[PDB]
Symmetry: C3
Subunit: 337 residues, 3 copies
């Protein structure tokens, strides 16, 4: 097991020990799943009720929660952010150290920093470029002239096409496909005719791309993902979308061709965006919303209906089908009075 | 071709022959696509009209349907369940018999039952564990310390991360990713900060996982899939979801972080569940529903609207935008009478 | 760089030069991103305002737009379709010329036209059949007795199962899975029992299949994709669906078991179709629509609600919950007058 003292861990997030710093810790855990060997935290004002009964060894707490506290504490401004920081010290994910696999193919035109690792059966086409301390997983395919900046981590079975440019510290889960040819077809008298896709992709720094997520290449200009953009799993980004820095998109979100999302935007799960619209900075879209027109006011937007028992849903739908009569009924009365 | 007598096939589901058991059969087919060489069935009271004209050789039938029947029958309590049983005898899917491929990599720390098969270019990291009569397809990646119980069938290009524990008789279609790092980020003054994902996955026995489906690893505790849980394709299960045994989820369903589904639940296609809610046992959610709050009453739940021609949809939406006036109009009249 | 004269390019789409045909061109570009080295076009009557200020070298234009035009033009009936045609001459996607990779496995029972290419670590099972001038990418898996007609292009990490038959000039982006076993289970007293999937797939000619798209094999008959059918990314086609020739489906669309779509149909993004319904020819379904019943009238169909600010959405939902009172209120008044 990986284990550390409260002192080593307090050091990492600059906390104050309020028991004994000598106490070993072997992993992290929620308030009411935590053992004596484990560090927890209170982030939610709500779970304030559940703190005393925790068998946690130690607890990341604001000075306020820590005050009159039965146990040993680690005191910090933001427990959750400290929790977030500490989480990496307990990550048991393997880290295949530097060098290529004999199996992995690499074109003679491909630069590949010595500090980087390429896993089994990998492939790397002509003009590729693997920046420093990058980690490329097994069965990954990098396409021609595609670029992963330093600190990148690509899980196995990730595919880049030709002409995909990525900043530093990229994180890409398995199954991801970047630079694919999206729907582009013209209608010649009711037959679809292939518009070839001759843009590429450009992705800034510190970007997460979740598993089985697809990002289409541009039609002419590049598909643009800004810096610190966090994309969950099963996401679809069409050709020529632009995403503002620090925008977060939850799972199963689909953005149509040429849509532009400003900065610090949050799209909840299974949001769709029609093509050729613009979303201004600081927009929250609630889950399974269909965004149909550009957004200029920052704030929160929804579509959908209240969940009901199916029977009540049928009565609602029917009450909705009779709105016309009700407005006819209501105009006949408007006359006589 | 694979072929069998009505007797061999009656044996397998303990049916009564009501023609001659000597009659060869070469495959199965629907009532009104069936040839003389083929066994059909009546499961639907509805298709009772379509039975006489069937050119089926033989028909799995309840005693009731079989009575006064022109053709040769196989009599059973449940034709459809008998149909289901017989279906496997006509499955032409290859079965790469035991042993590893020279190509496949296996770490020295990995146990791999002799009875199991590992296909071309496979990969198996340190501390892996391939139970007995498991079948691992080509380009599969098993991650470190991950465990497939006996009878497992993993199609090609399936990915397990580190620390994925799976019961017996697992069936996983291609493209599936289990143990991926889902969206977990804290907001440091408008920048997303990686919460590392240090849970794993635990999956019980007799579980189906469809193609390109993703199951996230836990943040701290494991992601939990109970026994006999049937997940269609393109599904997304976020970190720390719990699924009750015998729950079925149709394609394109997305379950957010920490949601709990009880047992014998049915989620129709493209249902979404917001995070941190609980669904009690025996809930049916109709297709493309957004479930926003916990469910305590067993039964059937919906959201969405009646499909209309687009023009009528526009008149509905407009009739809905004027509900406020209609309640103002209706309060002015409420006064004077 | 690839470069061509206006004359060579006018030749390809039979246009009339209305400056000098000697002028080299190095790529294509939108009206107001175009440099002097680049050919643009006016397809949209809307962007007619943006033509004069374009730094485009040359512009594909209808005679009408070209008339009194400051720059050098290429004159054609349909600029956009000419644009579509020309686009392929600037496609920088690599093209791994004929022959197999030493790495690639091929069964002795597999025919593989000499004109075709199979990339690194590919796999091709018994009874396969790679028609002429087909291109199979790295890590592709073709399953047993599956057939790609001539002119096919399969990106890397594409998976075919056993018994998948495909016409000519197929285009399949990465991550695609064709012939997977979809949800098929019977309920034996609340336990799901595997119905084996013993149909295959049949796909006509000139078909696009986008990335991470899944197409299920048939239960008994084949899954059917007609000719010139264009499927975007992240799409799910259940067992035994039928798609009419020239039907287009945008990204994240999900079609349930046994649904039939006629010809020249357009499904916008994230449309769902319930199983066992029929859609007649020439139907447009707007984005994120749930189609619940068969469609017989050609035209345009919708479900969903108008996007609102979340607050207004809450007032709408509440105004909708009080429709019953409003119809009670409206019946009490209907009495007294
Ligand atoms: O659920 C939360 O409350 C936050 C994350 C989120 O938006 C999400 C993730 C996955 C599937 C979903 C389905 C419906 C609504 C939301 C989601
Ligand atoms: O369609 C049925 O009636 C049963 C299976 C099912 O729920 C389904 C599967 C795939 C896509 C869907 C889209 C909308 C609604 C349902 C589905
Ligand atoms: O958006 C257009 O206007 C045309 C293409 C399209 O229908 C689309 C593509 C991807 C995601 C979507 C989400 C919602 C609505 C439409 C889409
Ligand atoms: Mg979806």
């Amino acid at each position: 097991t990986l284990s550390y003292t409260l002192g080593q861990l307090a050091a990492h997030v600059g906390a104050e020990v309020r028991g004994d710093a000598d106490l070993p810790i072997q992993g992290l855990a929620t308030l009411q799943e935590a053992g004596p060997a484990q560090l927890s935290f209170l982030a939610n004002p709500q779970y304030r009720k559940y703190l005393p009964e925790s068998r946690a060894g130690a607890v990341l707490l604001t000075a306020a929660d820590a005050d009159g506290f039965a146990g040993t504490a680690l005191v910090v401004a933001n427990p959750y952010l400290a929790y977030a920081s500490l989480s990496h010290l307990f990550d048991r994910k393997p880290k295949a150290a530097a060098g290529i696999h004999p199996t992995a193919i690499v074109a003679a035109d491909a630069e590949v920093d010595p500090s980087a690792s390429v896993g089994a059966y990998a492939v790397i086409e002509s003009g590729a470029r693997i920046g420093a301390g990058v980690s490329i997983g097994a069965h990954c395919v990098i396409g021609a002239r595609s670029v992963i900046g330093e600190g990148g981590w690509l899980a196995p079975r990730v595919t880049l096409y030709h002409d995909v440019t990525i900043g530093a510290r990229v994180s890409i889960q398995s199954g991801a496909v970047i630079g694919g040819e999206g729907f582009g077809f013209a209608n010649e008298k009711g037959v679809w005719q292939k518009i070839a896709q001759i843009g590429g992709v450009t992705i800034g720094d510190d970007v997460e791309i979740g598993a089985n997520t697809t990002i289409d290449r541009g039609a002419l200009s590049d598909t643009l993902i800004g810096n610190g953009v966090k994309l969950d799993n099963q996401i679809m980004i069409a050709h020529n979308v632009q995403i503002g820095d620090h925008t977060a998109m939850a799972a199963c979100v689909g953005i149509s061709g040429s849509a532009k999302i400003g900065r610090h935007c949050m799209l909840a799960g299974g949001v769709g965006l029609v093509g050729h619209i613009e979303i201004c900075d600081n927009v929250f879209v609630t889950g399974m919303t269909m965004v149909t027109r550009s957004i200029t006011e920052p704030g929160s937007y929804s579509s959908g209906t209240a969940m009901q028992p199916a029977a009540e849903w049928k009565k609602s739908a029917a009450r909705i089908r009779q709105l016309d009569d009700m407005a006819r009924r209501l105009q006949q009365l408007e006359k006589r009075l």
